[PDB]
């Protein structure tokens, strides 16, 4: 979990929101790099989001 430096489009909106209202935000990156939907694992009778 090395420190990266992400910037782009949504960062401006996030900064605007933090300026309008008091926010202390920390960004994170998903390990699998997927949006996340319903998946099937062992004991397939389970509906969990990844």
């Amino acid at each position: 979990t090395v420190p990266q430096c992400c910037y782009g489009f949504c960062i401006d909106l996030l900064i605007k929101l933090a300026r309008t209202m008091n926010f202390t935000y920390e960004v994170h990156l998903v390990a699998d790099g997927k949006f996340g939907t319903q998946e099937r694992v062992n004991n397939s009778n389970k509906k969990e989001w990844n």
């Binding site: 099937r40 009778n45 389970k46 509906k47």
Partner: protein, 469 residues
């Protein structure tokens, strides 16, 4: 080392005693061979049980007792739970009053019955309905202890599934003997398949009200749990035919088989204890009474019985004391008011069916019906394409209808199993439109006798021949 078993006037005593003695002597050689002390008492009384406990503890420190019974009384198991907890003697549940597991045993008790929990019945019913593709749900319940948690479990199980069952609200009766409020709540009763979680006494009046409203039709279905259908010999005239019930009976496992399984489990537990510890369990100095402090210096058998393997089958138990692989046979009411097996459940917690669809007929009233119209369809035409069921915990896609095909086992053994498949195509869409317009259920059949057919020897073959016949 010392095992005791009791039965009430079941059969001849000496032959059963000899068989039980021979039981552990056929195999499973262990340094401390277990003995059998079999006694036949027809009386089930508290102080009689206390005297039996005193006799067994004075009888070479009987390590465990197997309790058998003939009557159907749930209070016997409740009374015996306290005795088992106090005497520090494990007791197994066999057919009889203690066969059913309803009360929750104390954590310090050593009671483990052969019965099945309600949750297992719920998932068995869910599997049966999934096989029947009965997505319509209707839960009619009455105020009884433990039903609210069962409803919570069944809803948190159904909503977790990917099938997408109906989410009809539970139609809970306010109280028994309602001559007016039942008609008020009758508005919410609008479905096809109704699940009934009630008692045997009120089941008669519930079914009478259903008959008055007319729920005994071919399209309507009823599922009754094991507690209501406790006795298969007492069949009231108000029970409609085609009812689906799940229970367990001696039709597939006799008393000899059950006691064999019990003694095998006891021997495996004793062997595990001897492998782990090097102490012989001993009973209390006094069989009953509270004169000294309650202490259990020796570890119990709860962790030893987690892993049990006997005769190639893992007859293990869970933390709550439930069988991992119970019997859970399925019984459907016969035309002449009998019960027959239509599938088992011991096959690695899977579902088995004998492929018998039409078994429902109205008997409370007389009303013929012919909505079940069979339809025969081919496979070679591009307008209808068949697909195998995907082994991904789901039957098939939602945009199709079930169909059946006969597949011969070999090139000479003519025997076709009714494999369940889903047929999709343009003709399937036409059939769906016709079903939604005319409002009649339509079945599906697949051609297996060659091509369409032609007039040969003044005999029609194929689909045309089936239509003519």
């Amino acid at each position: 080392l010392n095992i005791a078993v009791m039965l009430g006037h079941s059969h001849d005593v000496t032959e059963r005693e000899l068989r039980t003695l021979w039981g552990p002597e056929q195999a499973a050689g262990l340094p401390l061979d277990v003995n059998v002390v079999a006694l036949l008492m027809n009386r089930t009384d508290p102080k009689s049980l206390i005297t039996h406990v005193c006799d067994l503890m004075s009888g070479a420190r009987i390590h465990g007792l197997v309790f058998g019974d003939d009557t159907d009384q749930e209070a016997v198991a409740q009374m015996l739970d306290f005795i088992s907890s106090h005497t520090f003697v494990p007791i197994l549940g066999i057919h009889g009053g203690a066969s059913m597991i309803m009360a929750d045993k104390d954590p310090t008790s050593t009671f483990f019955q052969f019965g099945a929990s309600i949750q297992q019945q719920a998932t068995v019913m869910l599997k049966i309905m999934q096989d029947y593709d009965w997505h319509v749900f209707s839960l009619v319940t009455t105020i009884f202890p433990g039903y609210r948690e069962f409803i919570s479990f069944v809803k948190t199980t159904v909503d977790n599934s990917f099938v997408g069952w109906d989410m009809q609200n539970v139609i809970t009766l306010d109280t028994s003997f309602e001559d007016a409020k039942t008609q008020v709540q009758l508005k919410k009763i609008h479905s096809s398949v109704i699940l009934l979680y009630c008692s045997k006494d009120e089941a008669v009046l519930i079914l009478s009200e259903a008959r008055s409203l007319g729920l005994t039709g071919y399209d309507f279905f009823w599922i009754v749990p094991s507690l209501v259908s406790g006795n298969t010999e007492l069949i009231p005239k108000e029970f409609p035919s085609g009812l689906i019930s799940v229970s367990y009976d001696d039709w597939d496992y006799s008393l000899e088989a059950r006691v064999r399984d019990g003694i095998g489990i006891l021997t495996t537990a004793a062997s595990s204890m001897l492998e782990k510890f090097s102490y012989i369990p001993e009973a209390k100095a006094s069989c009953y009474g509270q004169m000294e402090r309650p202490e259990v210096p020796m570890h119990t058998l709860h962790p030893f019985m987690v892993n049990v393997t006997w005769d190639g089958k893992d007859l293990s138990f869970t933390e709550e004391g439930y069988q991992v692989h119970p019997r859970l046979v399925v019984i459907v009411l016969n035309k002449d008011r009998e019960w027959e097996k239509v599938g088992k459940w011991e096959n690695h917690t899977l579902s088995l069916r004998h492929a018998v669809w039409p078994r429902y007929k109205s008997f409370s009233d007389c009303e013929p019906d012919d909505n079940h119209l069979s339809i025969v369809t081919l496979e070679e035409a591009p307008f209808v394409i068949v697909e195998d069921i995907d082994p991904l915990t789901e039957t098939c896609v939602r945009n199709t209808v079930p169909c059946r095909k006969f597949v011969k086992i070999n090139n000479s053994t003519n025997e076709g199993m009714n494999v369940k498949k889903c047929c999709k195509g343009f003709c399937i869409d036409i059939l769906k439109k016709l079903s939604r317009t005319v409002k009649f259920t339509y079945d599906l059949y697949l051609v297996t006798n060659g091509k369409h057919g032609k007039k040969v020897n003044n005999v029609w073959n194929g689909m045309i021949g089936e239509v003519v016949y």
